[PDB]
Amino acid sequence: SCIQFTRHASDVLLNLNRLRSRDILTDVVIVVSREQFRAHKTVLMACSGLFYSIFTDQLKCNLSVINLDPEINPEGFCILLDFMYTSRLNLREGNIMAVMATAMYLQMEHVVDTCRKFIKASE
Amino acid sequence: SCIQFTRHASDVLLNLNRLRSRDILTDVVIVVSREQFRAHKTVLMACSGLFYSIFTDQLKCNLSVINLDPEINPEGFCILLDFMYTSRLNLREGNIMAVMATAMYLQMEHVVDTCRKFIKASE
Amino acid sequence: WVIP
Amino acid sequence: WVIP
Ligand SMILES: N#Cc1cnn2c(Nc3ccc4c(c3)CC(=O)N4)cc(Cl)nc12
Ligand SMILES: N#Cc1cnn2c(Nc3ccc4c(c3)CC(=O)N4)cc(Cl)nc12
Ligand SMILES: [Cl-]
Ligand SMILES: [Cl-]
């Protein structure tokens, strides 16, 4: 018999992105080649099958630094990290291949889906 | 020129509630009289003006235990904590006064609003 | 607020 | 997915 506040989940995510921008309570740095991205492990796990697996691991759960595969593109990761915290995906002709490859590695199925559909439309 | 995934914020919140249920990466215990509630500081701050103030404080940000005012009702807190993690508010005739008082203390304006409207309708 |  |  609960009532539900429609905008609550979006409002929570907006405040989680504000915390990220101010570097408040971030507990991990994701290293992608020469670039570093600070984030909250809980948000990363909530968005990505890869991070969910990593941070449920009894040893990796305590690491402050995670190094991604050297094939991962930093811009592609940046775009996906922004998506995690905002629901908005900056998908462009010039970045779609990197975004899709990064989303496959991060196991972000909905992003992979749409990248596949946008690529199919251009061929 | 971003695209947006409509269900993303709800999906994130669902996974944050799964983390809470499994006690994964919880970093604080909220003590309400004889009861204890484990949570994630980032979610508490994202939902509550009181916790936002507490956890941005340069000393309180590092506490693992927060004790609420002894006038706070544990069930009212439980209902609001569930709301934080689900967008669903279990508002009942028998708990509305406790929920509204707890929401005022926690500075959860939308919950206070609706409690006020539900009370006004019954008088 | 809505009835979900 | 939508145009926000
Ligand atoms: N507890 C917990 C918890 C935290 N996070 N999380 C999940 N995170 C996840 C796992 C796989 C995938 C995605 C997110 C997006 C995607 O495409 N695949 C799942 C579950 Cl079942 N549980 C949890
Ligand atoms: N950074 C950050 C950040 C984390 N959380 N958070 C806010 N959390 C908040 C503050 C006040 C109120 C509510 C939530 C619900 C309500 O009724 N009042 C606000 C801002 Cl402006 N910023 C942040
Ligand atoms: Cl996704
Ligand atoms: Cl609220």
Cβ of residue B8 closer than 8 Å to a chain A Cβ: yes
- Tell me the technique behind this structure: X-ray
Q: With an 8 Å Cβ cutoff, are A88 and D1 in contact?
A: no
Instruction: Kindly report each contact of residues A74-81 with a partner whose C-beta sits within 8 Å and lies 24 or more positions away, as own/partner.
Output: A74/A32, A74/A33, A74/A34, A74/A35, A76/A101, A76/A102, A77/A30, A77/A32, A77/A35, A77/A37, A77/A102, A78/A35, A78/A37, A80/A106, A80/A108, A80/A111, A81/A30, A81/A37, A81/A39
Alpha carbons A40 and A27: distance in angstroms, whole number: 6
What's the resolution in A? 1.9
Give residues with Cβ within 8 angstroms of A11, minimum separation 6. B46
- CA-closest candidate to residue A31, choices A88, A78, A95, A91: A78
Look-up of token digits 């020129």? B1
Cβ of residue A95 closer than 8 Å to a chain D Cβ: no
Alpha carbons B51 and B66: distance in angstroms, whole number: 10
β pairing state of B88-89 and A3-4: antiparallel
Which ligand 1 atom is the nearest neighbour of the CA of B24?
A: 1
Q: Is B49 in the pocket of ligand 2 (CB under 6 A)?
A: yes
Q: With an 8 Å Cβ cutoff, are C4 and B114 in contact?
A: no
Q: Are A108 and A89 in contact (CB under 8 A)?
A: no
Q: Is A109 in the pocket of ligand 1 (CB under 6 A)?
A: yes
Q: Is A13 in the pocket of ligand 2 (CB under 6 A)?
A: no
Chains in contact with chain B (at least 3 beta-carbon pairs closer than 8 A):
A, C, D
> Could you give all domains of chain B from N- to C-terminal order, each with its CATH number?
1-123 (3.30.710.10)
Cβ of residue D1 closer than 8 Å to a chain A Cβ: yes
Q: Are A114 and A79 in contact (CB under 8 A)?
A: no
Alpha carbons A13 and A117: distance in angstroms, whole number: 26
